[PDB]
Amino acid sequence: MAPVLGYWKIRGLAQPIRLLLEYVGHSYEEHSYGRCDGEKWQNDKHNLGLELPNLPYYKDGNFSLTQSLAILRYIADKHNMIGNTPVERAKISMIEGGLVDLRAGVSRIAYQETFEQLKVPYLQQLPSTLRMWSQFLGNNSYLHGSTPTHLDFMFYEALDVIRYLDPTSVEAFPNLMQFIHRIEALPNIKAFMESDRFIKWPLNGWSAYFGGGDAPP
Amino acid sequence: MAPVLGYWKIRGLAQPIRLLLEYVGHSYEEHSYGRCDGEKWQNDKHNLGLELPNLPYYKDGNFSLTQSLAILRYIADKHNMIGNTPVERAKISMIEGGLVDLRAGVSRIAYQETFEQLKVPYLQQLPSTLRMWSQFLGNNSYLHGSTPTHLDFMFYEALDVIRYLDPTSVEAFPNLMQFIHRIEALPNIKAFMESDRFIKWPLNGWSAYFGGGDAPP
């Protein structure tokens, strides 16, 4: 019946997609692959009709996609959240790119042993990165236009992951904190987050020294 | 008068932009940062009017962008290459994501001392990735539609870099070689590749162990 979103049973790259789906209210099924389901994925991989096999994937009948940003932009596009002029469309793609980097910064250091060493320079850098994001947000409720878009769920997830790594870093910018609360207050987001479905943990792949494991440390 | 692309004087993330710009004739000047211009950049960084400062950038009057894919898409959009329906748009974004992944597989190991060890499993996985790309392209001349797009220059650059790392990986796929030759024969691209301004080297940032340094070994 309903479209499928396949991903590891983790937050990671798919969580902004789930948040967007939930916020716009579109029906979907998740096909989760748990920590011990590596081989199940291997069996499905070349077998789902996908043109560029990967996780996450997204299947709706005949139509299928991979690449998390493409999936997210597909849903976004349905709600006219990707811009209407070359200038605006570009601006949105820049925002996405920066948000991809914001998230990936955490991922780049989370999978190696020396994470606690790497954390040190990371936090030296972070405040300017965050400052950049807080000036870009400014006094607006959302990153672009005046209602939530996929950029906002991207940004929320990144922030939330990063607050976890160091709660005070994000806490130093009032507008980012108020943003975090703004999104958590969105009724479909709140309901989702309070539901059976919601995946609080892990933030990254299970094998991560930070954001990994079956539960928080 | 002319728009400005700014980047390190390397191939890297900018090469497909440059290739696209030279293919369509969107006239431009290139503000180049050399190996020893770290300080230069640091100082322009916050005084170029950039909302999200970063390399590469693109300035065109009052308009500016960062994010390599965003710049790429801005130009492509102006030339009708990012699709016209939500489905087509979404597939194009999927192909982009796959292509960024393909280029990044090189970058993720090339900067590490340990590159020659990491090379070995990279080359074990590589044949399966190239197979995916080879079948996705099939008998078509170009990745999407019937004329060159930004995807085809992202793809060309990724494959050229990979061929350099391991020629016969790519030569095992005749359709991929024909694609490389097809791009190289486009008259605008050819004249470009033969010009003084072209950058043949380095592939990655100078400080890299694969595709780094001021010239090939």
Ligand SMILES: N[C@@H](CCC(=O)N[C@@H](CS)C(=O)NCC(=O)O)C(=O)O
């Ligand atoms: N750029 C891709 C990266 C996807 C990716 O690397 N996915 C990983 C986990 S986050 C995976 O398990 N891929 C499946 C596979 O390698 O077969 C995206 O955004 O989707």
Ligand SMILES: N[C@@H](CCC(=O)N[C@@H](CS)C(=O)NCC(=O)O)C(=O)O
């Ligand atoms: N996701 C960005 C990455 C940008 C990036 O990492 N740029 C590096 C060089 S590859 C840089 O020098 N950034 C400028 C800076 O960090 O100040 C893109 O695609 O443009």
Ligand SMILES: [Zn+2]
């Ligand atoms: Zn809808």
Ligand SMILES: [Zn+2]
């Ligand atoms: Zn033109």
